[PDB]
Amino acid sequence: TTALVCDNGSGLVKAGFAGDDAPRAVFPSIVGRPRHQGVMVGMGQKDSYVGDEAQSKRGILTLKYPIEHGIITNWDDMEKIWHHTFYNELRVAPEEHPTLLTEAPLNPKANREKMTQIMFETFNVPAMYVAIQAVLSLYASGRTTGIVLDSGDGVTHNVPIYEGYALPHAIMRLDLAGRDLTDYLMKILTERGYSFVTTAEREIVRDIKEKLCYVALDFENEMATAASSSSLEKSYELPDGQVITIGNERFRCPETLFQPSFIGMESAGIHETTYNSIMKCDIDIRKDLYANNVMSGGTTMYPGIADRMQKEITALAPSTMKIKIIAPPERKYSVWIGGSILASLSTFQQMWITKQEYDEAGPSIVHRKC
Amino acid sequence: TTALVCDNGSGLVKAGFAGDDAPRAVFPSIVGRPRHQGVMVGMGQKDSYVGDEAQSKRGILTLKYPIEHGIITNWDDMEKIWHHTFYNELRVAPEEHPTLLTEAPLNPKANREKMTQIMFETFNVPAMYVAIQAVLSLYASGRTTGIVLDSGDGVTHNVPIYEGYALPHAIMRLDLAGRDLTDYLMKILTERGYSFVTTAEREIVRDIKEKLCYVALDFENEMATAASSSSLEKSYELPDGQVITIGNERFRCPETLFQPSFIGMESAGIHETTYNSIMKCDIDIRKDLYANNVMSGGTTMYPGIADRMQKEITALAPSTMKIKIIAPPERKYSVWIGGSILASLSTFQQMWITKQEYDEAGPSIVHRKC
Amino acid sequence: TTALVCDNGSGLVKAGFAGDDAPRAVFPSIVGRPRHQGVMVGMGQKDSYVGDEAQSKRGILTLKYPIEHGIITNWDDMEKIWHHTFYNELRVAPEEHPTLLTEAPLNPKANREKMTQIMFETFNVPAMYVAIQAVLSLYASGRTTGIVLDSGDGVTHNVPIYEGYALPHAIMRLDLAGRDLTDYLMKILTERGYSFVTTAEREIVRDIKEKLCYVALDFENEMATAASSSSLEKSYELPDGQVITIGNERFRCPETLFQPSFIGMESAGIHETTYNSIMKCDIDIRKDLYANNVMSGGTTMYPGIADRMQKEITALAPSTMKIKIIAPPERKYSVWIGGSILASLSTFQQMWITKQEYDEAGPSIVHRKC
Amino acid sequence: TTALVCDNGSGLVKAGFAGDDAPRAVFPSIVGRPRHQGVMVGMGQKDSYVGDEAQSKRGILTLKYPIEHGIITNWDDMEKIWHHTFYNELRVAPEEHPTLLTEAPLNPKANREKMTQIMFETFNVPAMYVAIQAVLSLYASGRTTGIVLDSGDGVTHNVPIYEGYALPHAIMRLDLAGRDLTDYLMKILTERGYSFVTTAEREIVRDIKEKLCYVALDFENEMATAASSSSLEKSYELPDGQVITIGNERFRCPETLFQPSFIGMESAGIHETTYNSIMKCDIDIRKDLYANNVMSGGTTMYPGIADRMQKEITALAPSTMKIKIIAPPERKYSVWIGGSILASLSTFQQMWITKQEYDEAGPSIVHRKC
Amino acid sequence: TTALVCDNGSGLVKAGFAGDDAPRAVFPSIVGRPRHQGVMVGMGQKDSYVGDEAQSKRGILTLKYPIEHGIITNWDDMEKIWHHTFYNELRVAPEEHPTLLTEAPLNPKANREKMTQIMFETFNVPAMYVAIQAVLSLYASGRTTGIVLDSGDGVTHNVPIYEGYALPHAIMRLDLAGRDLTDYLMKILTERGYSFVTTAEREIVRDIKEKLCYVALDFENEMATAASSSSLEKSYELPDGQVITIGNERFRCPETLFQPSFIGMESAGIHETTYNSIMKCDIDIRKDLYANNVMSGGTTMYPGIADRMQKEITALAPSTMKIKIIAPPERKYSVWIGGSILASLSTFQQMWITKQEYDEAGPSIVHRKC
C-alpha cells in the first residue's frame, strides 16, 4: 500500500499520492449549502455541495470555509470534505492507505487530537502522521537549513531550522494571510464603487486578487505614481460581463503583509517577523539563516514580495550578512511536495502512528509521536 | 386514476390529461348572461352560456370574464366554468382524478385558499396541487436554468430560476397583458373610425389583435415608414361583412408591451422588467440567466417579439454576454404541457395535497405545501 | 382683429367672439330641403334652408343633422352651416379672424384633418386651433382640477384632469346624449297613443323633452308613485293645437342616462362611467377628483340630474369622501364660454395653427399641435 | 456668518442652522417630473417639482430619489435639491455661510469628490466640511464611547468608537434600510390583494410602514399568535378612501432587519453585524462597547426595536457583560443635531476646507482633510 | 530636603519618599501612544499616555515598555515616565529633594551615565545616588549577610554578601524573569485555543500570570496529575467577558525559572545559579550563605518557589549544611523598602553625588562614587 499525502490546509485542499510531485486533488475547501427555495421535482438537488462543484454552483450556495485561521472551526463539514477528497476525487478506500496530514504550528491541541480521532475512527486508515506545514517546505526545497515562511489563506509561519533542528522558541505564527487580504480587498474596492458582499462575490474578489494583484517595490512611490494614470489600471471582467478598472487598489491588497497597520493588526509585517525570528536564534546561526529564507504557501506567489522581502530584510540585517530569498517558482505546492518526499523515505516508516498505538493510548498519542 | 391538468388562465381555459402533450379543452373562459328579452315558448334559453357556447352566441349575451388580472373576482361563475370543463368537455368524474391547477406568482392568498376549498367541496377531488405558472414553462421546455416570461392575457411575470432553485426575491409581476392590449386596441381603433364598444365587439377586437398585429423591430422608424402608404395596411372582414383597414394601429397595440406609457402604466416594458429581474440576481448567475429567456403565454406569440426582445435586452446588457430567447413555436400551451409533464413524474406523486390533509388541517395547507 | 370661437356641436351651433360671455349665434345645425312640389313662381323659393330658418319651416322641409354622434358624417352641408354662421349672424370676414373649433375626445382623425382643410381652403382664416370640448369647460369654470362631463345631441365623455395634466388613458366616451334621448322619447310616446315619426315630429318631441322632462331622484319610487294617477301629468300643446299629457314617460326618457339598457346599449350609465373614469386615475388624484364633478353640455340641464348623479356616485364611492358636483346655472354654454376665455389669453396666441404652417406642412399638423 | 448643517441623507434632506437643535427644513428628497399630457395653457406648469411640493402633487409626477443606497447616482437633480433647500427653504446666499454636509461611511471616493466640486463651483461656499454620519450621532448623544447604528432609508453602518478613536477596520456597512423595507412591504401586501406599483403608491406604502409597523419581540411567537385573530389587525385609510387591514404583514416589514434572508440578502441581521463589529474590536474595549449601542437614523424608530435588539445581543454576548442600548427619543434627527453641535465648536472651527485650499489643490483635498 | 527614592525597575515603577515603608507611587512603566484614527474635536486626546493612565485606555494604545531586560533601551520615553512620577504622581519639585535611583548589577555603563546625566541636566536634582538592587534588599531584610535573589520582570541576579563586603566575582546575572515568563505564557496558551497577540492582550496574559500561576513542587508529579483531571483547572474571566480554563499551563509558566530549557535558553535555573554563586564564594563563607537566601522582586511571589527552591538547593548543597530561604511577605517592595531605609541613614549622607561634584568631574563620576 502506498502512502497518501493530503495537505489539508485552510484554503484549497491539495491532496494526492506519495512519490509524485503534483497533487491530484486541488479544489477549494468550501462546503456550500443552498439558500433559495428549490422548486423542481425531477432534479436531484444535493443538500450540500463541496469543492469545485460548490465553487461552480455559487449563485445558489452559502459557502462556508470549515477552517478559519488555520484551525478547524466546524468539524461536521471538514469530515465531508475529507470524505469527498478520499472517495470522489481520488477513489481509494482509506482503509488500505497510510495518511500524511499537516497542521500549522502553534495551533490548539484539540484540533490535532480530533483530526487524529476522525482519521482513525471514521476512515480507519492503518497509519497517520501529521507534520508541521512548514518543515515539509524545507524537505521539498531540498535544504536542511533555512527560515521557512509559510503563507496562504490562513496563517503565516517563520520556522527556523539550522540542521534539521527546529528551534521551537522562534516560530512566529501570524494570521495575516490571503483571507484577510481578500477581506481587505473587498473593502478597498468599495472606495471605487464596486460592492461585493456575499460569498459568491468574495470568491470573485479572491480571483481578482489572484490574477491582478502585485506587491509594490516601494509603496510610498507607487502611491505617488498612481496619482497620474499609468499602466496601473487593468480591467477585469466579472462573471456577469461588466468590467472593473482597479488602478490604486492592486498594490495595497498584498502590501498589507508588509504594513499590517491597515487591517488594524499591531504585529509587524512578514518582513519583520522573519527578522525577529532570526534574532531569536543563536549568533552562530543568524549569519547563515540570513542566506536562505525559503518561502512557501500561495500568498507568496505575488509578482512582488519574492523581491521586496529581500530589500525589507536588508534594511534590517547588518550590512555584511548575505541575504538570499529562495523563491521556488512552484512554492504554491512546496508543502505537499515535501509531504510526498518525506512519506517516501524509508527512515520514516518508524514514524507512523500505527492504529495499534492509537488504540492502546487513545488520541493523545500524537502529542508525543509527532 | 390519472391526473388532470388545467391551466385556468385569464383567457382560454386549457384543460387536459397528464402525460399527453395537447390540452383536450381549449375554450375561452367567459360566462354570458342574455340581456335582451327572450320571447319564445319553446326555446329553452338557459340563463347562462359558458365558454364556446357564449362565444358563438355573442350578439345576444353579456360576456364577462371571471378572472380579471390573474385573481378571481367573481366566484359563482368560475365555479360554473370548472364544472363545465369537467362534465362537458373532458366528460370525466372529478372524484376519480388528481387535479393540477396553476396560478401566476404574487397572487393573493385568499385566491389560493378559496380555489382549494372549491376543489375540495364542489368536486371532491382526491388530491389537488397548484403550481406557479412559470415553473411549468421550464418543465415543458426541458430546462432548469431559465427566466420565464409567461404573459397570457391577464398578467406578466418573469420568475428567474437558476438550477431548480427559484429566486423569489427577484420576480417582476406585471399587470399588463393581452387583455390590456385588447382594450388599447379597441381604444386606438376609434382614432380611425371603427367603433367597438360592447363586449361582443371587444371579442372582435381581440380577434383582430390576434392575427393582424405584430411587434415592430424598430417602432420609431415604423411610425415614419407607415406614414407614407406602404404594404403596412391590412383588411379584416368583420362577422358583419364590412371590412376595415388597420394601417398604422397594428404595431402600436403590441408596442404597449415595450412602452407602457401608452396606457398610463408607469412601469417599464417587458424588455426592462426582465433586465431588472436579472440585475436583482447574483453575479455568478446572470451569465447563464442572460442566455435562456424562455417565453410562455399567449401574448408572446406576436410575429416579431422574439427578436425585438433580444434587441432591447442587448441594448442594455453587458456587451460581452450572450443573449438568446428560447421561443418554442408551441409556446401558447407551454404552461399546460409543463403541467402534464410535472404530473407525470415519479418523484411528484407525493407533493399532492391529498383530501385527507385538507380535512385534517383546513384549506390553509396550500400556503405551506406549495 | 379679434379671434372667433364656434363650438360646432351636434345640435345648437354656438358661435361668437373671443372675450364676451355670450355666443352671438345659437341655432340648431339642421340643413333641410323642400320635399313636396312647390308651384309658386312669384315667391322667393330658396333651395336649401339652414339653421333656424329651416327650423321655423318644418312641414315642407326634411331636416338633416350633418354632425351625427359627434362626428361629421356629411360635409357638403356642414360647410353650408359654417358659411351661414360666418355670413349671416357674425357677418365677419373670415380672412381677418382666427377661429377656435371644438371637438369631443376620441373622434376619428378624418374630422380634424378635413376641418383644418375646410377652414384653410374655403374660408382662409389666418389661424385655427381646435380644442377638446372638456378642457374648455374647465376653463369656463375657472378651475384646474375636475372630471368634466359633456353631453348633447349625441356625445358623452368624462375627461379627468388633475392640474392641467389631462389623463389621456381615462377618458370615457359615450354616444348616449340628447339625440338618443329624443329618439327614445319619440318611441316611448307611441305607447300612450301619440304618434311622432317624421323629422318635424322629432323636433316637436325635442321641444317636449326640453321643458317637460326631469331626472327622477328615485326611479322605483317614482314608478310606484306615478302608477297611481297624481300631479305628475303635464299637458303640452303642439303647434297644431292638440294637447297631450305625458304622465309617466317624462322621467323615463332621461333615465336612459343612468340605465342605458333601455336603448339596448350595454355600457354603464353616466353615474358609473364617471366612477370608472376615476378608478382609472391615480390614488393621489381620486381624493380631489371626487370633489369636482363639473358638468357641461345641454343634457346635463335636467331639473334633477345635479343631485341624482351625486346620490348614485356616493352610492359606490368610498364612504369618507366628499362629492361636490359643480353644476353651474350657465352650463349649457360652458364649452363656448371656456373657448372665449382660453382664446383671450396672453400666452395662447402662440398655440394657434397659422396659415403658413399648414401651407408648409399640410393639414396633418393638428395631430401634433393639439 | 453662521455655519449650515445639511444632513443630505438618502431619505429626507434634514437641513438647518448650526447652534440650534432643530432642522429648519425637513422634506423628502425626491425630484418629480410630470408624465401625463398637460393641456391647460393658463397654468404656470413648473416642469420639475422637488421636495414636499413633489410630494403633494404625486398623482401627476414621476418621483425619483436621486440617492440610491447612500451613494448619489443622479447628480443633475441632487444639484436641484441643494438649490431648492438653500434658496426656497432657508433663503440664505450660500456664499455667506459655511457648509457641513454628511456622508455615510464606506462610500466611493467619486461621491465625495463630486460633492465637494459642486459645493465649491456651483454655490461658491467659503468653506465646506463633510463628516461620517455616525461620529455626529456620538456628538449628539454626548458620549465618546459607543458603537453607532445610524440606519436610515438606504444604508446601515455600525461605526465603533472607543474614546474619540474610531476603529476603521470594524465598520459594517449594510444596504438593508428603510427603502428595502418599503419595497418588501409593497411586495408583501400583495398577500392580501392591495396592489401598489407606481411611485405615488410606493410613498403610500412607506407612509403605511412608518406609522403602523412595529417590530416583534419574538417573531416565531407572533407568527403563531397571528393565526387566531387578535389585536394584530389595524386599519389604514388610503388617500383614495378605501381602508386596508394589514393584520400579519406589519411585524414582517421590519423583521427583515433581523432576518435579511427575506429579501434574499445573505448578510446577517443588524443584530449580528453589531456583534461582529464588536468582536472585531479589542478585548478590553468590548467591555464598554457592549454597553453603549447608540442608535440613530430613521429606521430605528420602530416600537419594538430597542428591545428585540437587546434580546438578540444578550443572546450571543457573554452572560456576564452588561448590554445597554441608548435609544434617545429624538433619534430621527440625531445625526443633524450632532452636526449642529460639531459645527458649534471652536476646536472644529479650524477644520473647514476653505475655498483657497480647494482652488489650490483641487477636489482631491477631502480624502485627506476628512 | 527629604530624600526621594524611586526604584526604576523594568516592570512597575515604585517611587516614594524616604523614611516610610511603602512606596507612594506604584504603577506599570508603560508609555502608550494611540494607533487608531482620532475623530473628535472637543476631546483632549493626549498623544502619549504614560503610566496607569495608559492602562485604563489600553484598547487604543501601543504599549511600549521603555526598559527591556534591565537596561534602558528607549530614552525619550523613560524621561517621560520620570516626568510623570515626579510631577503628576508625587507633586514635588525635582530640585527640591535628593534622588535615589537603582540599577541591576552587570548593566551597561552608558545606562547609568545617561541616567545621571538626565537627573542632573534635565531635572537638576540636588544630589542623586544609584545603588544595586540587591544590597537594598538586604537593608530591607535587616541583615548584612545573605545571597540575595532579585528576580522581577526583566533580570534575575544573585549578589552574595558575607558581611557588608559584596563579592563582585559571584554576581550571577540571568535575564529569565517575569517578562519572559509572560512571553512564554502567551505562547503556551495558544495550545488551548486562546490567542493573545497584541500588547493590550499581553497585559491580560500578565494579569492571568499574576493571580493564577503557582510553582509546582515535583514538576513531573504535577504533570502526571494533570493527565487525569484534578482541581488544577481555574476559570479566569477576561475583560471581554468570556472565561478561560488554564488547567495544565499554570505550573509550566513559572517552572521555566527552574528549567530554562523551555524558552530555549541554556543557563541553568534560578535554583542552580544561586548554587553556582555560592560555590564561587569561599569555603568559610558557603556554610553560612547557605542559610540566608534572601529573596526579592515580583516574580518571587508565587505560591510555589520558596518551598521548592529550598528543596532544589538541598538537593545540591552538601547534606550537613543548613538551607533556609528568607521569604518575607513584602518582598515585592523589598528593594524600595531598603532604599528608604538606606537614604535615611547618617553615614550614607556623605555618599550622595551632589550637583557640585558632577559638574567638575563629568557624568563619569558615578563609576567611582558607586
Ligand SMILES: Nc1ncnc2c1ncn2[C@@H]1O[C@H](COP(=O)(O)OP(=O)(O)O)[C@@H](O)[C@H]1O
Ligand atoms: N497566483 C496567485 N497569486 C497570488 N495569490 C494567490 C495565487 N494563488 C493563490 N493565491 C492565494 O493563496 C491562497 C492559497 O494558499 P494555499 O497555500 O493553497 O492555502 P493552503 O495552505 O490552505 O493550501 C489562496 O486563497 C489565494 O488567496
Ligand SMILES: Nc1ncnc2c1ncn2[C@@H]1O[C@H](COP(=O)(O)OP(=O)(O)O)[C@@H](O)[C@H]1O
Ligand atoms: N396567434 C396569436 N398572436 C398574438 N396574440 C395571441 C395569439 N393567440 C392568442 N394571443 C393572445 O394571447 C391571449 C391568450 O393567452 P393565454 O396564454 O391563453 O392566456 P392564459 O394564460 O390566461 O390562458 C389571448 O387573449 C390573445 O390576446
Ligand SMILES: Nc1ncnc2c1ncn2[C@@H]1O[C@H](COP(=O)(O)OP(=O)(O)O)[C@@H](O)[C@H]1O
Ligand atoms: N332646458 C333643457 N332641458 C333639458 N335638456 C335640454 C335643455 N336645453 C337643451 N337641452 C338638450 O341639450 C341639447 C343641446 O346640447 P348642445 O349644446 O348642442 O351640445 P354641444 O355642447 O355638444 O353642442 C339639445 O339636443 C337638448 O336635447
Ligand SMILES: Nc1ncnc2c1ncn2[C@@H]1O[C@H](COP(=O)(O)OP(=O)(O)O)[C@@H](O)[C@H]1O
Ligand atoms: N416614525 C417612524 N417609524 C418607523 N420608521 C420610520 C419613521 N419615520 C421614518 N421612518 C423610516 O426611516 C426613513 C427615514 O430615515 P432618515 O434617517 O430620515 O433617512 P436619512 O438618513 O436619509 O435622513 C424613512 O424612509 C422611513 O422608512
Ligand SMILES: Nc1ncnc2c1ncn2[C@@H]1O[C@H](COP(=O)(O)OP(=O)(O)O)[C@@H](O)[C@H]1O
Ligand atoms: N502577586 C504576584 N504573583 C506572581 N507574580 C507577580 C505578582 N505580582 C507581580 N508579579 C510579577 O512581578 C513583576 C513585578 O516585579 P517588580 O520587582 O515590581 O519589577 P521591577 O523590578 O521592574 O520593579 C510583574 O511583572 C509580574 O510579572
Ligand SMILES: [Mg+2]
Ligand atoms: Mg497553511
Ligand SMILES: [Mg+2]
Ligand atoms: Mg398565464
Ligand SMILES: [Mg+2]
Ligand atoms: Mg358636445
Ligand SMILES: [Mg+2]
Ligand atoms: Mg443616514
Ligand SMILES: [Mg+2]
Ligand atoms: Mg525589582
